[PDB]
Amino acid sequence: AAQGSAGSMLKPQQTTTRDLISLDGLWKFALASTQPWTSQLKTSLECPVPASYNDIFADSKIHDHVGWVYYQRDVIVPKGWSEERYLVRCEAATHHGRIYVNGNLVADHVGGYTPFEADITDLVAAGEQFRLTIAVDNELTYQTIPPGKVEILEATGKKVQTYQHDFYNYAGLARSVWLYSVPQQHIQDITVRTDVQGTTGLIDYNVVASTTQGTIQVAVIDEDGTTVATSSGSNGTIHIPSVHLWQPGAAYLYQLHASIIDSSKKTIDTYKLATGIRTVKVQGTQFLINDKPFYFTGFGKHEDTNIRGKGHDDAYMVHDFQLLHWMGANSFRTSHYPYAEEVMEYADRQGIVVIDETPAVGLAFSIPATFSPDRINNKTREAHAQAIRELIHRDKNHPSVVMWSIANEPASNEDGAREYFAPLPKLARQLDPTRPVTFANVGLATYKADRIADLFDVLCLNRYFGWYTQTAELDEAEAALEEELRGWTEKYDKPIVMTEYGADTVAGLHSVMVTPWSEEFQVEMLDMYHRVFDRFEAMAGEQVWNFADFQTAVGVSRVDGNKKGVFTRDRKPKAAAHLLRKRWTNLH
Amino acid sequence: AAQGSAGSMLKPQQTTTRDLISLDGLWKFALASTQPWTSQLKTSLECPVPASYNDIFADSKIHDHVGWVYYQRDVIVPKGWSEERYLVRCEAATHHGRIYVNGNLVADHVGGYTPFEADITDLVAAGEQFRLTIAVDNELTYQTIPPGKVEILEATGKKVQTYQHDFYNYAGLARSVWLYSVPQQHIQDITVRTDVQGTTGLIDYNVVASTTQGTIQVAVIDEDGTTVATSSGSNGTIHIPSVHLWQPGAAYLYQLHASIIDSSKKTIDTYKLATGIRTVKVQGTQFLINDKPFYFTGFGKHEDTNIRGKGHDDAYMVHDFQLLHWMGANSFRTSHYPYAEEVMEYADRQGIVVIDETPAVGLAFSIPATFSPDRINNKTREAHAQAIRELIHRDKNHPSVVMWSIANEPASNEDGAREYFAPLPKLARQLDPTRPVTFANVGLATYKADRIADLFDVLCLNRYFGWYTQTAELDEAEAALEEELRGWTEKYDKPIVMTEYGADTVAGLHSVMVTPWSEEFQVEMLDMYHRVFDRFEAMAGEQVWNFADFQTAVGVSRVDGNKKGVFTRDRKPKAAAHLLRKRWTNLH
């Protein structure tokens, strides 16, 4: 883990040449008390892996814990492995993960939403058994990339985790853990850039191999199963005659088979990696996927379900996606962190557009000046960029991912904000020149007051007039909102997307009168917002906040988390769901 | 209280000539234990009058009580009263009411929904104070007009009230009590029959005076305040040039001022009684109010609110009516009993159409043969007719009331049913030849199976396929329902009204899938029913069941009463409300 760079490999898969093993299951679990990774574990406490631990146990001490926790289990390297290089991966640690093989530290990793792994091949032998213990610290600071500070309670002395975001600070191994193998000479990375000449579809590729052994073949197969182009070399471009384009309601995916042939006509490594072929351009006030203009519809979302909290779930993913299709949503935004990788591949097959967001949420203090040597400084920017790299490295390939979101609701109206943010969108366009760049702008940072927006390609606005400013005054709110829309459309020649608009709603709370927290009120606000968007020709999309009720930090104005959900936390449609379905399916 | 007749007076009002006093307030209250009406009352227990007692006290014994209860309070006759005849009235007793002046029985009355009164003028003196005690028995039997049987619990021996209806058996003084005065020679009744010659509006009247003193004047005033016709005599007809007609969305009411002038040009009694002028004809498959065809929209309703249960409430009435206008409902049906009189006058001013129903609900046993010498016999029919009389006597005048409903869901497919019912619609047409006659038919009594319908003018159907028969099978239910609609339209040349269709819904229970008890399911059933009605040209109206969740007898398939409400018991709109508003306001 180095400054200015990203060292993950490709998403482990199984092949004729590589082997894959799941470490998911229950693991022994305990709380920081000393040096637990040097002996076995002493607990009847077992925690499921793909999951956040906080809610799992029905224990207050555990849920409330500030610091490190310890997952542990034994592992056996299959005896079939020697002559194969093998290693241990975490798709994500809560925030700060550490990997111990038997009681030597083998990896330390600061991102909370991106993979990390350790090559253990010289460290254990094929056929041998070791003690995998993984340490996850949930502590946020001013330098950690969702920012925060631990404090202490004057009377009881209890440790307490402050932060500036909405959603609860769920910790642990939220994403699958793996033990896999790769041949000594292997493909480590692949870069795919899809473009279109007339009707001919060309993808520039780039394959990275552990050594300089043999050569690099690439077959490119269609959905039916018949290869449609081939190539040699670590890099080039591939021509596809009469391409089936990946379309935002009509996913087409070709399968790029990268192989590492040895001296002779023999395959020694291979890797299957799906791409779809699509361009993304912003021209002025317009968002083009495949040179036709596009309008987002959908939600910012969360990784949040009932007991597992943030832990990725196969069936909620599929269900969630069906609800999107049910209502004719075409996109969503990975809200305030990168989601599980498997959600991105699913999004690709599913033909859903994604706004991929770094875990930079709450870069402000006004939910004290936020950009200084105290709160958000240069060491913080360093971590912010560190996170931009790992996200892009990981996600660069998904045709569904369509624009990077640098941050949520940063204090972009304050002195200091511009210096801070300047290198970040520039980093993004550099590492990946194919997609546009944005961040979701807060209400305070008005068109006048914001000093960041010009550095970005698309304008993403979060607004809540009918909620905060004009509380229940929908007409006075329609005033405020078009005031603001005008301001942006006049000052800038970018396209605009409402990334956040909504109102807390308690399922079953009804009222014939104007009343916030009533299914009815939610409808009305949503509806008048829509009416306003349609009168602005500069709008390029709309994302309700949020998909579904979700858990947040304890708070008096938070009714057991955030209820701005259009669906309940158990995924049941409020009235708003049906409004959105009616608008999204019945017009363009 | 005599067989073949009805002895209530006109609804007491205040005038230049009559005086009115409310007895409402808290009264001392106690349960049958002996002969409590002969001394004062011994309880800290006070019960509000306009109200049903069962829910009021938070006491199980009281709520559960089977038998008589005793309301009591002192009353003072104003000293201004002598030379005026005065008396004591109950707008309604729970079911069986008794009035004691000081400990002599002065009235005994078997209806549960119609007024009764006692002339106390020779019994107390103006200026004197007496002990008004009123006894209300809540016991139903096979002869009482909502039928039932008290049973006993083998183990505990507890008394327990069985009955065949849905709604809870709320007992007590549900409607206001009064002490009023009337001159010695006074108007006791008035009969108004409104008709139309071309554009000239003629109302036949009939005034009944206690004695043969003086003569009878009648002024007929418009809404502005200017008398537009006059007349003399106990009876005649009045001609109104270019009448403003009472219309089903446009209430016009003239004020008929009946006066009893004495030997000389002096008024000795007077009474203000509003009428509106409208005809009601059924021609074949068509329902005509003022010779233009009419389609009902609305609900069967209940007199049921939170703590008072059945007790009439001013503000819920007005609110309830506003909800009707809010959603473009034009009618409702007094569900399974006559409602408070003041609701009928309000309905008149409000321009809402009413189906006025007797308290004959549950005339069946299949919710054992119901028409015999055991269950529903001739003594029962006698009470049924006794109730038809008092309803008509009371309600004959309201332009809003538009059709009589003889019974709810009687066992009209069974042998015995025809003999039983034969004299009842005939009685109704006789006592009041101006309105049509009906009853609401049960699902069992199919077009084939029912042996009553031909005796009635309008066909009123209660159906619940998408609920009972085709449970959640909306398509298989659309089959069943049009099967049935065809049958009736073919066999008979009457118009049809769906008096009941609905599905229990728990506020806030949502589902993207087909699931009963979910706000969504309610919408869907309601919607497909509508689609079916529109394809039948014989339909003359639609009344959802029900307006609002309401309390019923304890039962496992009754989630704290009946949830077939479109609004909650606290009057909050479920999704169905908005569907109905959308259908009723956007088309004819």
XYZ file of C-alpha atoms in Angstrom, chain A residues 165-474:
310
model
C -22.492 11.428 7.926
C -26.048 10.019 8.286
C -25.626 6.308 7.989
C -24.455 4.220 10.925
C -20.774 3.334 11.322
C -21.115 -0.391 10.779
C -17.776 -2.222 11.279
C -16.208 -5.622 10.394
C -15.718 -8.037 7.496
C -18.670 -6.773 5.388
C -17.448 -8.555 2.263
C -16.311 -12.016 1.359
C -12.904 -13.386 2.289
C -11.017 -15.730 -0.019
C -8.070 -18.063 -0.368
C -7.036 -18.504 -3.980
C -4.248 -19.615 -6.269
C -2.618 -18.306 -9.379
C 0.105 -19.759 -11.604
C 3.639 -18.462 -11.048
C 3.402 -16.506 -14.288
C -0.020 -14.863 -14.182
C -2.259 -12.064 -15.341
C -2.515 -9.429 -12.583
C -4.447 -6.624 -14.240
C -6.459 -5.798 -17.338
C -7.524 -2.454 -18.691
C -10.361 -2.091 -21.171
C -11.367 1.103 -23.019
C -14.342 0.699 -25.308
C -14.991 3.001 -28.268
C -16.925 3.062 -31.564
C -15.839 3.731 -35.183
C -19.020 4.119 -37.235
C -20.587 0.736 -36.550
C -17.257 -0.891 -35.813
C -16.528 -1.353 -32.135
C -12.964 -1.064 -30.961
C -11.674 -1.841 -27.457
C -8.154 -0.903 -26.407
C -6.834 -3.398 -23.912
C -3.881 -3.846 -21.609
C -2.796 -6.998 -19.794
C -0.220 -7.184 -16.958
C 1.614 -10.454 -16.290
C 3.607 -11.403 -13.222
C 6.679 -12.286 -15.429
C 7.831 -12.099 -19.114
C 7.176 -15.811 -19.807
C 5.394 -16.786 -23.084
C 2.974 -14.360 -24.818
C -0.510 -12.828 -24.381
C -3.540 -14.107 -26.326
C -6.932 -12.537 -26.162
C -10.149 -14.052 -27.513
C -13.260 -11.884 -27.501
C -16.476 -13.848 -27.361
C -20.114 -12.820 -27.832
C -23.148 -13.697 -25.688
C -23.964 -16.712 -27.875
C -20.482 -18.227 -27.387
C -18.683 -17.536 -30.675
C -15.362 -15.632 -30.640
C -15.574 -12.542 -32.854
C -12.025 -11.155 -32.676
C -8.568 -12.186 -31.377
C -5.293 -10.442 -30.587
C -1.757 -10.894 -29.394
C 0.459 -8.840 -27.178
C 0.168 -7.257 -23.766
C -1.758 -4.523 -25.543
C -3.436 -3.266 -28.674
C -6.961 -2.635 -29.780
C -9.587 -5.118 -30.969
C -11.930 -4.440 -33.859
C -15.507 -5.593 -33.619
C -17.524 -5.556 -36.848
C -21.117 -4.393 -36.293
C -20.842 -4.279 -32.482
C -23.676 -5.069 -30.143
C -23.415 -1.997 -27.884
C -24.009 -2.124 -24.138
C -27.129 0.033 -23.761
C -28.622 1.611 -20.604
C -31.772 -0.516 -20.877
C -30.357 -3.345 -22.909
C -27.145 -4.791 -21.582
C -24.883 -6.501 -24.119
C -21.669 -8.025 -22.712
C -18.850 -9.645 -24.651
C -16.431 -11.930 -22.825
C -12.738 -10.970 -23.152
C -10.638 -14.099 -22.610
C -7.083 -13.044 -21.709
C -4.623 -15.943 -21.795
C -0.885 -16.324 -21.210
C 0.467 -18.868 -23.694
C 3.906 -20.311 -22.947
C 6.869 -20.862 -25.269
C 4.748 -23.473 -27.048
C 1.100 -23.373 -28.121
C -0.056 -24.044 -24.560
C -2.104 -22.028 -22.068
C -0.495 -21.482 -18.659
C -2.775 -18.752 -17.309
C -6.252 -17.509 -18.268
C -8.902 -15.042 -17.100
C -12.482 -14.301 -18.069
C -13.454 -10.620 -17.786
C -16.736 -9.259 -19.206
C -16.946 -5.895 -20.968
C -19.703 -4.138 -22.792
C -18.973 -1.488 -25.341
C -20.191 2.074 -24.745
C -18.925 5.648 -24.913
C -19.667 8.392 -22.391
C -19.481 12.037 -23.402
C -20.671 15.258 -21.842
C -21.415 17.850 -24.504
C -22.349 21.075 -22.731
C -25.665 20.554 -20.964
C -26.086 16.982 -22.145
C -25.113 13.528 -21.078
C -24.395 11.097 -23.855
C -24.145 7.375 -23.595
C -23.415 6.131 -27.126
C -23.821 9.631 -28.560
C -27.535 9.702 -27.671
C -28.527 11.980 -24.770
C -29.401 10.301 -21.426
C -31.487 11.164 -18.345
C -30.792 9.430 -15.033
C -33.693 7.948 -13.102
C -33.267 6.113 -9.834
C -31.844 6.556 -6.328
C -28.748 6.998 -4.301
C -28.716 3.705 -2.321
C -26.999 2.116 0.673
C -25.474 -1.200 1.568
C -27.792 -1.753 4.511
C -30.169 -4.606 5.367
C -31.579 -5.955 8.613
C -29.136 -7.861 10.743
C -25.968 -8.014 8.661
C -26.069 -4.235 8.267
C -23.544 -3.369 5.551
C -22.645 -6.962 4.645
C -23.271 -7.752 0.977
C -26.278 -9.956 0.359
C -26.941 -11.917 -2.842
C -30.706 -12.021 -2.577
C -31.288 -8.449 -1.489
C -29.131 -7.392 -4.409
C -31.227 -9.310 -6.887
C -34.472 -8.228 -5.224
C -33.289 -4.568 -5.102
C -32.513 -4.684 -8.813
C -35.922 -6.177 -9.602
C -37.551 -3.342 -7.746
C -35.573 -0.926 -9.938
C -36.833 -2.647 -13.089
C -40.262 -2.868 -11.525
C -40.420 0.921 -11.419
C -38.351 1.712 -14.501
C -35.338 3.152 -12.682
C -32.255 3.155 -14.940
C -29.522 4.212 -12.549
C -28.446 4.584 -8.991
C -25.483 6.039 -7.102
C -23.234 4.060 -4.782
C -24.065 6.170 -1.784
C -21.076 7.442 0.124
C -18.888 4.415 -0.470
C -18.056 1.846 -3.164
C -20.393 -1.110 -2.937
C -19.439 -4.781 -3.236
C -17.738 -5.580 -6.528
C -20.377 -8.227 -7.406
C -23.036 -5.488 -7.449
C -21.110 -3.743 -10.217
C -20.897 -6.846 -12.381
C -24.563 -7.429 -11.699
C -25.322 -3.851 -12.699
C -23.511 -4.616 -15.974
C -25.549 -7.684 -16.791
C -28.614 -5.779 -15.584
C -28.053 -2.725 -17.775
C -28.216 -0.282 -14.894
C -26.173 2.924 -14.999
C -23.982 3.609 -11.958
C -22.543 6.731 -10.376
C -19.591 5.276 -8.487
C -18.769 7.183 -5.280
C -15.690 7.241 -3.020
C -16.177 6.961 0.703
C -15.586 10.696 1.191
C -18.856 11.650 2.948
C -19.208 14.380 5.564
C -16.189 16.415 4.488
C -17.940 19.247 6.327
C -18.724 20.233 9.916
C -21.995 22.078 9.302
C -24.644 19.286 9.340
C -15.833 25.227 12.903
C -13.984 25.573 9.556
C -13.509 22.240 7.930
C -10.478 22.778 5.722
C -7.467 23.411 7.961
C -4.569 21.812 9.852
C -7.070 20.437 12.373
C -9.976 18.816 10.531
C -9.478 18.080 6.832
C -5.860 18.795 5.901
C -3.309 17.428 3.442
C -2.901 14.091 5.122
C -6.672 13.791 4.687
C -6.521 14.734 1.028
C -3.828 12.112 0.691
C -6.216 9.438 1.939
C -8.969 10.852 -0.200
C -6.798 10.369 -3.269
C -5.579 7.001 -1.997
C -9.260 5.988 -2.079
C -9.888 7.474 -5.531
C -7.101 5.228 -6.849
C -8.296 1.979 -5.375
C -11.856 2.653 -6.531
C -10.859 3.376 -10.092
C -8.342 0.501 -10.165
C -11.101 -1.790 -9.094
C -13.995 -0.382 -11.083
C -12.462 1.034 -14.291
C -13.808 -1.882 -16.354
C -17.611 -1.899 -15.669
C -19.684 -0.587 -18.579
C -22.410 0.173 -16.030
C -20.149 2.597 -14.179
C -20.545 5.811 -16.058
C -19.199 8.704 -13.911
C -17.077 9.076 -10.779
C -18.348 10.869 -7.741
C -15.426 12.276 -5.754
C -17.291 13.154 -2.525
C -20.619 13.620 -0.805
C -21.682 16.997 0.550
C -18.246 18.446 1.154
C -17.973 21.974 2.554
C -17.376 23.371 -0.907
C -18.458 26.919 -0.149
C -15.670 27.496 2.435
C -12.241 29.020 2.046
C -9.824 26.153 1.714
C -12.215 23.967 -0.267
C -10.723 24.652 -3.708
C -7.072 24.015 -2.765
C -8.230 20.871 -1.138
C -10.282 19.508 -4.013
C -8.189 20.714 -7.001
C -5.995 17.621 -7.596
C -8.868 15.168 -7.059
C -10.998 15.485 -10.115
C -7.709 15.891 -12.099
C -6.463 12.601 -10.675
C -9.676 10.940 -11.753
C -9.653 12.145 -15.358
C -6.002 11.145 -15.555
C -6.291 7.584 -14.184
C -9.403 7.089 -16.300
C -9.985 9.393 -19.228
C -13.125 7.545 -20.452
C -15.663 8.809 -17.815
C -16.764 12.271 -16.603
C -16.217 13.566 -13.053
C -18.453 15.004 -10.356
C -19.293 15.300 -6.693
C -22.671 15.686 -5.025
C -23.124 19.275 -3.914
C -24.726 20.337 -0.612
C -27.562 22.839 -0.228
C -25.396 25.415 1.577
C -22.987 25.545 -1.323
C -25.417 27.464 -3.546
C -24.601 28.360 -7.146
C -23.273 31.662 -5.762
C -21.544 30.284 -2.690
C -19.826 27.196 -4.099
C -16.216 27.585 -5.140
C -15.542 24.041 -6.450
C -18.068 23.231 -9.177
C -16.169 24.576 -12.166
C -13.512 21.861 -11.753
C -16.095 19.168 -12.439
C -17.811 17.848 -15.560
C -21.342 17.209 -14.291
C -23.215 19.125 -11.569
C -24.835 16.903 -8.962
C -27.164 18.663 -6.529
C -28.624 17.463 -3.226
C -31.599 19.598 -2.244
C -34.292 19.424 0.438
C -36.268 22.674 0.391
C -39.682 21.098 0.920
C -38.015 19.649 4.005
C -35.382 21.929 5.535
C -35.921 25.435 4.164
C -39.627 25.628 3.327
C -40.865 23.117 5.903
C -44.139 21.857 4.432
C -44.452 24.969 2.309
C -44.440 23.295 -1.060
